Design a protein that fits this description.
part of a larger assembly, 7 chains, D: alpha+beta, two-stranded antiparallel ribbon, 1 helix, 2 strands, 20% helix, F: alpha+beta, Gyrase A, domain 2, RNA Polymerase Alpha Subunit, Chain A, domain 2, 4-stranded antiparallel sheet, 12 strands, 21% helix, elongated
């Protein structure tokens, strides 16, 4: 994480696709190093199909510069998450901020 | 504000302290500035260029 | 050539009709194999591993 | 095979055998200078500060 | 740069420092005074030199 | 030429302690403290986990289904597990556990020389009711820093594709500091003390360590004594 | 957990006073750990016999000029501070230097005593000019352990044998290892202890303090 910072790093992490942002708010049903399944709140949920949002995380894979791009879950089993929250950090991102 | 945060820190206002050489163990004349700098590793890495 | 022919004669090795193009790890780089993919032309039999 | 014995033979051939060092924007003749090789672990070139 | 800052800090003089005014036979025991921590690097001193 | 000896060794936490050396002559407090700081921080006996063969894992870069820690991170967590042995130079510990919850360092199989100084140290979590992880954790003992890279030279058919190597972390010591305060013995001109405040992961006791330090110290002076 | 030991130790003599010794197989950081611990004790605590208190002929205080010698009182003490001697069965011996006549007054003109050994009889104390000129001084020389300057005391105690000590750590390549270090110890002495003896006795006192943790 940057110890000295600005406050844009939070915004940069989310707007760039490196991270995984919550589609809808709720409580996490399942947390794995592979995937993340979120149980949607009813106010945010559409009437049909009920639903849960399943985020399939990217694992160790080749980048353009031959670096490693790998996602890790930043949330824990059974935790409330609100829409627009960081579910998993990407490479060089820590808890929603940008750590280079 | 930085100096003020340093008062809450227990650390000097100067941002400099005394440092001792790990070899001779003797002191270093004058205080030296020590702190935490964010540092990046760029990829020019020596076992590419070589 | 004559002396290569004598060499094989003493050590009795059959020099193959096929030359080795095998892909080998570049000098100095060392790592762990995390994946393998095999693409094959349509109509050539996919081997065992594939 | 990089057998351990070859390293000592290299110290012999390096000893008295200068090498030429050069930088990217060569201007005057000092852009190339001869040095005596010193075997050094690692992939980086070490260059005398005064130069 | 670094080297010239060393020699500048080396031969320089402050107004009052450890060992000010004493006299030494030669540079050998001058360094011996400094390295042992008795005399400061910069102090006005008469020493016999050749 | 009055010689020193140790004095009250005050334990504070299971981690660190302040050892003290009472009889130091003029300036010798510094001559020792730095020379002792040197050997304390660097060359010391330690036992750090080395070879780890896990359940279904081919390499450190995959993910085992049912655990939210990447295999690479679990290896890294092991590098920070502090243990201590007595009579064995390598012991292989068998770790088994399942069920939703944290898998700590106390869930392993105890051995005669095994003492886990931090049973709460987190190896990884477990995200599913039935998911089971078995691992052979091969811990050996040695000195210094041996990175995983310099270990794959011996190799000699380490064919066990599942045996993932980690970097040897071997060392008890974390932070060593020495302070010399003037110690006044009832009669003497001026004498000094030695306050050595050290810091450790708990795998070595202070008196044992500071002894073996001076041991190696004088042992190198051996040749020096003659020529 | 076996511990690498040194080997090879070529001792290059530089005349009779000083020399550069070398030690090839020193592990990580031990070049400083040794070199510094030895530099410390060499410069500070060592056996020596150095002139301390000097009572002179006519002039008692340092602020004057003695008739018949071209050396100011301050400068003669410095030469005396550099006169190297050794005693045997005495913890203090008071010598007596006498001479007259035009010429140099050297260190062989003193009064020899049973325990007196002058290691530099040629050492110049001061000269002697026109006429006959008279110099007599009772020079009280004592024994101790270190460098005691005249301020804390009357001249500065030189009892150190050693003059200049330097340690250099150069990277030593043992047949198989990354980087190991060497130790080049260039020492300097007044001749009242032999270099090989000193470096022997130096480490001696060092390890002798360890006698409680062995």
């Amino acid at each position: 994480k940057p110890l000295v910072g600005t406050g844009m790093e939070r915004a940069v992490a989310v707007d760039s696709g490196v991270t995984a942002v919550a589609k809808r708010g709720g409580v996490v049903q399942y947390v794995d190093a592979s995937r993340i399944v979120i149980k949607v709140n009813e106010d945010e949920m559409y009437p049909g199909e009920a639903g849960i949002d399943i985020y399939n995380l990217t694992k160790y894979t080749r980048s353009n510069q031959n670096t490693c791009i790998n996602q890790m879950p930043c949330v824990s089993l059974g935790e409330p998450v609100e829409r627009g929250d960081v579910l998993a950090d990407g490479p060089s991102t820590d808890l929603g901020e940008l750590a280079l | 504000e930085i100096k003020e945060l340093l008062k809450l820190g227990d650390l000097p206002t100067s941002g400099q302290i005394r440092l001792y050489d790990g070899r001779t163990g003797e002191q270093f004349e004058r205080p030296v500035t020590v702190g935490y700098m964010y540092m990046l590793k760029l990829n020019h890495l020596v076992d590419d260029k070589m | 050539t004559p002396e290569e022919k004598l060499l094989r004669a003493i050590f009795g090795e059959k020099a193959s009709d096929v030359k080795d193009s095998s892909l080998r790890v570049p000098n100095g780089v060392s790592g762990t194999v995390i994946d393998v993919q095999v693409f094959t032309r349509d109509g050539v039999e996919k081997d065992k591993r594939a | 095979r990089e057998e351990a014995v070859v390293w000592d033979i290299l110290d012999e051939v390096i000893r008295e055998h200068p090498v030429l060092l050069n930088r990217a924007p060569t201007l005057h003749r000092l852009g190339i200078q001869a040095f005596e090789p010193v075997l050094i672990e690692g992939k980086a070139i070490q260059l005398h500060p005064l130069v | 740069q670094d080297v010239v800052l060393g020699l500048y800090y080396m031969t320089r003089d402050c107004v009052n420092a450890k060992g000010e005014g004493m006299v030494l036979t030669g540079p050998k025991e001058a360094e011996r005074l400094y390295r042992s921590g008795l005399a400061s690097l910069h102090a006005r001193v008469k020493v016999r030199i050749t | 030429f009055l010689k020193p000896r140790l004095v009250d060794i005050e334990q504070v936490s299971s981690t660190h302690a302040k050892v003290t050396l009472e009889p130091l002559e003029r300036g010798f407090g510094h001559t020792l403290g730095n020379a002792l700081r040197r050997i304390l921080l660097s060359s010391m006996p330690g036992c750090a986990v080395t070879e780890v063969e896990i359940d279904g894992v081919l390499h450190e870069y995959s993910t085992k289904e049912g655990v939210q820690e990447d295999i690479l991170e679990i290896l890294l967590n092991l590098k920070g597990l502090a243990v201590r042995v007595q009579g064995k130079d390598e012991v292989i510990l068998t770790l088994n556990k399942s069920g939703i919850g944290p898998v700590t360092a106390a869930d392993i199989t105890h051995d005669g020389d095994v003492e886990i100084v931090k049973p709460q140290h987190v190896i990884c979590h477990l995200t599913d009711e039935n998911a089971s992880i078995s691992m052979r954790i091969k811990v050996q003992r040695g000195r210094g820093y041996v990175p995983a890279s310099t270990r794959i030279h011996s190799e000699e058919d380490e064919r066990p594709i599942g045996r993932l190597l980690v970097d040897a972390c071997y060392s008890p010591v974390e932070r060593i500091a020495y302070n010399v305060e003037a110690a006044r013995v009832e009669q003497r001109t001026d004498l000094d003390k030695l306050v050595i405040e050290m810091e450790t992961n708990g795998t070595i006791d202070p008196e044992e360590a500071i002894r073996r330090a001076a041991t190696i110290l004088a042992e190198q002076l051996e040749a020096f004594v003659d020529l």
